[PDB]
Amino acid sequence: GSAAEVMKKYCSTCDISFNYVKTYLAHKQFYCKNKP
């Protein structure tokens, strides 16, 4: 068994998911609340 576990469509820090990858992109861009 490989310990891959993929999930590039869910911002754990925000606690949300996005079916569309484009959403996750635009999210981490300037939509995410991951302020410095």
Residues that bind Zn ion (CB under 5 A): 11, 14, 32
At closest approach, how far in Å is the CB of 25 from Zn ion? 11
| Residue (1 or 22) nearer to Zn ion, CB | 22
| Residue (9 or 14) nearer to Zn ion, CB | 14
Judge whether 15 is annotated as a binding position.
no
Q: Is 32 exposed, middle or buried (0-12, 13-18, 19+ CB in 10 A)?
A: middle
By residue count, the chain amounts to 36
Among candidate residues 11, 35, 13, 36, the one with its CA nearest the CA of residue 23: 11
Residue list for the binding site for Zn(2+): 11, 14, 27, 32
